[model samples]
Target: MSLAPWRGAIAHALHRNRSLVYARYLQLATVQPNGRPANRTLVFRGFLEDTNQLRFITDTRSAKADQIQQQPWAEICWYFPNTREQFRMAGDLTLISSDDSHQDLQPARIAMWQELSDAARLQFGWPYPGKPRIKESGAFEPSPPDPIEPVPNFCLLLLDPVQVDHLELRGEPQNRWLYHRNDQQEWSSEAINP
Candidate 1:
């Protein structure tokens, strides 16, 4: 399929499989408080249609979380072999507290929060199972009750995407293009070098 038609198709797929979008997550290179480019891959959590933002969950104590506080700018890359397509996104991240963002799904979010409370489950991090378990994976069981004093350790990070780069392996010439927003809040799309 040509890149043009595939572009729209890819966007729709991303919007649909918001979960699998984490198959490939590249943290943008940025200067930490001490001044050094730090980057790492995190999981893709959810998306917000109102702000055209992408969401991911992380512990408040994470190194990346600290970096985000100092500098909100970051980039992400997504690749899917089954579809033979890739996407790159550059944007700013905002830390949303269940209290501040009014993260409406408190009950559901808290349930999710409890699931990550297991130390064994967080050993390798990124929500992936490590070492086989006698029982089904961590994903199989239901979440536990919230801590007595819920201090908001597990928080949702929102990525406000300002631009997206779409690429397809089957195309010739300009197989990649960029869709970006201008100052007026209008989007201008154009083809860029692959």
Candidate 2:
């Protein structure tokens, strides 16, 4: 149960694409309650400290959080332009909300809140995601919430990837590798046809 082998490959991709800020963006795919495929682009918030889990944040008031609650299984498709590489991460998402009672969960939640930029943190207090917009200027300028503590609607979503598919598009025939976790949580990686 050590680190996933694909970690290095992803780390390398991130390094080569470091100059491009958008390289940190990834697409999260989930299943809607109505059985439709839901997809959204999210900025990568880095990994959970010392863990392979990918960190992301969402508002409990957002449709994304509700969809994850309906189904925790999801896939993340990440593309690195500088290297022409892609990583497809399949995992179960764990939502650490303000109400989550786990001792460590709350601390991590707070830590994530503190790491956020002021502009980003202010969004947690914004009107419900995807809600109808108000024409009044006053309706939109809500005060920011505590910088140290997140609002109830703020959630820390962690993707515990069980499988990762890494691919490089620049090769003559292309190169692809698959990494999966075993029952004991040990990771095994193998090269596969692209």
Give the top-scoring candidate (TM-score). 2
**TM-score, structure 1 vs. true:** 0.65
TM-score of each: 0.65, 0.95
User: Across residues 1-194, which tens digit of lDDT does each residue of candidate 1 receive?
Assistant: 11322245556656555566464454554459887777767766545433466666666656776788889887777776655567878878876544555456464445445445465234323333333554546555535433432345566677766788888776774377788876766667888787
lDDT of 2: 0.88
Q: Model 1 Cα displacement at 114 (Å)?
A: 9.2
Error of 1 at 190 (Å): 0.5
Model 2 over residues 14-93: C-alpha lDDT tens digits?
A: 99999999999999999999999999999999888888888898888888888988899999999999999999999899
Please list the C-alpha lDDT of all candidates, in the order they appear.
0.61, 0.88
Model 2: what TM-score? 0.95
Query: Residue 179, candidate 2: how far off, in angstroms?
Result: 0.6
